[PDB]
Design a protein around this ligand. Sequence first.
Ligand SMILES: [Zn+2]
Lengths: 263, 449, 606
Amino acid sequence: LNLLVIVVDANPIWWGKQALKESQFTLSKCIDAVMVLGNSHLFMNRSNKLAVIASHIQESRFLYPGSKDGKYELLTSANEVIVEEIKDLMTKSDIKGQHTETLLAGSLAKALCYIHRMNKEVKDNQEMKSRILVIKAAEDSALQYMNFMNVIFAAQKQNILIDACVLDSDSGLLQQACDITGGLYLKVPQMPSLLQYLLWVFLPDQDQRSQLILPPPVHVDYRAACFCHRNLIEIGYVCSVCLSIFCNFSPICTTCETAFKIS
Amino acid sequence: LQCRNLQEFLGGLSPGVLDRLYGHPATCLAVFRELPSLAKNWVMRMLFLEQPLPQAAVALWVKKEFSKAQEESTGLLSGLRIWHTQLLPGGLQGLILNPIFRQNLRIALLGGGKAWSDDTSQLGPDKHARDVPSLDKYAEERWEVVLHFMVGSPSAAVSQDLAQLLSQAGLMKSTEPGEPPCITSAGFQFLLLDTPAQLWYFMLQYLQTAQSRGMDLVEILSFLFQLSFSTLGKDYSVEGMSDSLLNFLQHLREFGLVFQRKRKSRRYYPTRLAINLSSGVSGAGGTVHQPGFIVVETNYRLYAYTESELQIALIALFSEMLYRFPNMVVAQVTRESVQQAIASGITAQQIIHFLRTRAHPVMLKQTPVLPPTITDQIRLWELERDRLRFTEGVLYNQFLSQVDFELLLAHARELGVLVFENSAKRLMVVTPAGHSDVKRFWKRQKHSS
Amino acid sequence: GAKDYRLQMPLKDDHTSRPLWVAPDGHIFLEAFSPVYKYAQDFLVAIAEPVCRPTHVHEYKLTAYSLYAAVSVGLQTSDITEYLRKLSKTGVPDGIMQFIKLCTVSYGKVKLVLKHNRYFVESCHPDVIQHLLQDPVIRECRLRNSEEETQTVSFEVKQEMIEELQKRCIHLEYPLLAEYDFRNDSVNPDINIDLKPTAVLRPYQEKSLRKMFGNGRARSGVIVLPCGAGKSLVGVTAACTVRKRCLVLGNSAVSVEQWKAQFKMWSTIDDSQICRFTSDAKDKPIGCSVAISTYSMLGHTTKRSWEAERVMEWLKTQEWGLMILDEVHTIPAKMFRRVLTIVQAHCKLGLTATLVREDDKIVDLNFLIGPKLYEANWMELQNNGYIAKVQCAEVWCPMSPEFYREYVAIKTKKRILLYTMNPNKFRACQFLIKFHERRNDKIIVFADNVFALKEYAIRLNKPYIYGPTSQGERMQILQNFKHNPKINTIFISKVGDTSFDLPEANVLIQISSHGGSRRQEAQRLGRVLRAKKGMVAEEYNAFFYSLVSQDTQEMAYSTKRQRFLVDQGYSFKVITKLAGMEEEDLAFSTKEEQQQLLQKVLAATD
Ligand SMILES: [Zn+2]
């Protein structure tokens, strides 16, 4: 009984640039790889459950919610419902200047509560292991960091491992999320070969992962920049009232607007 | 009963016969579930890659600590023929998934040429559809009928086809004019054995006599895998099944594994027994088929709160019953009653297991009630039987030099006619039937002098 | 071997609120787990006598004598049947109900009243007395030429013929009812006896005495009670409750002293006046009135006159209280009838733990001493902590091969001696002594043969007490073991008496099971092993070991012991191997030493 939840950050602008590039890898290919990985996860154990979620620029949609070709009926039905959901969301998009980048944090927050309701539905006597697979092609957002950090803490409190694979560029928010959860972090050099990477590391259960040799998660550096002048400092004074990093000591703290008490 | 677990029967099969079993997509899914996680994950990894993978690469993937566990799984795959060695030009030898097994797993995983084992043209509502609770009752009653032949009750309504299978199985033996049914010692042990294990043993006996019938062993095995995964809510179509499968379905109705509204009906209803059938005991202290109804006491008093003729007969064989009432049956585990069970032929461990399997919930979690004090006495009676051994033995005399006797002992030991070395006393324990061969060797020793 | 009572009892779906199964044979099964069981158990004790008492399910079989005791209490016939219906899972059989009706038809078929120390028989109906008079034996024994009496017919009955009348009454199906009137006995003087307020009284003992008194005058009853565990207290408390001079009979001389010791603390009357018939103290016998005697054993005929004649005469006149009996099973059959002849008591009280007395199915003295009013629960006593929860382990030792060949060869008592003197059995006892020595707990060893324990004790340099020893020397060794705080292994014979002390000790080893007095061995297990501390915890310092020689058929007695154990509630286990007896330094380990032991037994005359 293992629950695998797959969250993909889909940006129509970024995917459209990939289509303009005419590279062999496509958004359609990425979803096909996810569906093949999902069929394999259900195939290995009947008890194992698969949930697929795609994040739109302003909204998050849950894709997952016979044997015509001799394919298993449950696998065929699951793929069909996902195919209808993905096509409807991608074909129609609303362009927003304020939010040209999809919100991974909003999709992650929806996934964590969805796992929590499913865990309550699952009987206490049976034991379920919950893991999240994240594929991100969109650029990271500085504004989304505050929302993103809270979802990582929610996963840590619920003890849900987060495993993230980045198609093009590593994201600082995404790598930090994997480090806090303890989930493996991987970067895929070849986007068409992403499915093979998913099968080797993401597909195996946690007990299976220990038995096999898998590449270690990349070490994540910790960086502290004062928000006062957006400048990185090895040592930064932190105000007690507002808990905000400062490059240099300030007699009056701008972030809370209070004046520091001087003896 | 040895637990095949989709492994022992598969092992030792001809590679072509294993490929024929792999021909069905459903069997490949069942084999994939049977495979251990390390082997199952590796089969999925090699499922998408045609190229054979070298042994050195296979060793590299597993950690050195877990490499030993992988080797055992790899041996199972090679025996099952799932992995066949391919000789590369380089010294390392590639390992490639069996093509028929790989294609059928691919057909289950993704769209394939095959139309699937079960096809329904367009059937929805069923006339006289069998209810799921009624199916469970029917399955229990049919198995009781097979057992009840070993009781002599009028509830034993076998179809004579089942009776012929029982004689072939050897659980029940018919001897004397009129072929009156009798219970073999193995049959008493079979009655003691749990129902899922009993079903598995009966299926193995059916496979043994299937060759004389001419029914295909692979086709019967494929149906058995379908029965294990069968769902009571789901309904399956008789049409699309081979004539041998139709004959197997009629026997399945006698077993109670499958319920047919009509023999010629094109729709059949899966039954609880088919899902229950497996190569394993249902529980050490519990039965899936029946909730525990036997109260076990160190005093040897047994109370049964469920009234059934078959259940009473099984309780009677191990323990004589002082009183009979519908609400409660009073039974005592007398030394004489256990001795009668030994005379009929029974396993002492099985009697303890039977009491534990049907033990009352209050009895569960109490250390003294589970083992009766009589078990120590049963071991003492077994020791008395072990102490006295009967076989016919011929006697040889005038052995003289010990070395000549030792040469005869080696020949006798190979024959197995010898019971004991008896090197000093120099008296032969050779059986009279094997005496002539030993005498020929002894005469040869005299000629050699 | 299977009996179906489904036809006998109609099936009704009332099992949740009912813990009893009622059958025509009268066997009844009680569920211990059910809450209603406690009320059912009290009803079962009054109307039925239990063949066995397994802890998981209590077995009670209806008995006519037990039913008669309930009729003597005055329970209504309809009420007894109604209570059975309330607790019955299935409808009560009509035939069993008819059997209950006949027993409860009259509270007393014949009523016996003591007036002026004379056993007058008084009947509400004259015809019933006429039917009793019809028997020729009754006419021969009838006393002739020796008040609101409305509807009362009274004829004087000889005290000597009273025991014979009880047997004749059973033949005529007209059982006697015991009634005592204090006002009718004008000659007897009222006296005041009060139990000390400071002295503690056990609850079970108080309940049994309250039941015996019942309504108005005390009613004769036999109470099963633990022996050596407050047994003396129940009788002395009963004497205080009666407030009339009473006599206690104990076969053991030591037991008589223990009964006196319990009496001395509560009553300051004893300090002013003390008389003991036992030991011929004879101190102010007329003035003291209360006296202590030992059945007919104390009396001697032609050995002494003057004083012996006076001692017998004083007991009858001074004491008119109900007779008290202890260790009834040890007492021989007809001894009670002899005591009844020498002194006459209005009521009879019996205080012995054993359910069966004298271990004879054919001969029972229960009818002479009256029905058993109440039975103490040994499991309840273990919960109280008054008695330790004894753990019984059976150690099985193979008969020595040299010994076995002699054992089969001779059917003489010497073969029984060879079985009793088993070297492997002796090694097991020696290993048990070593195991107890490591524990440091006090250990006692008992052998059925009088000299068998002495021979083992000489080999182990251990103190031994046997039946042919001076009482003072035997008592002094017992005082050193209990009064002095020292740990040692003591070998004890039956000694013809049971000895218990205020200090409590536990642990016993049984060398052999061939003893003729099977009940005495069963009583010894309860008397010898006592709780180390009051309100003892579930962990037990009491360990009982039985040594069984294989192939000597010693197991047959062990099976009988298990039936006694289930009623006690004592934990029972069997160990074929001591798992370390062989790995120990023990005497007679070598086969040659065992052969020397075999030669010595053969040399000794049978
Ligand atoms: Zn601040």
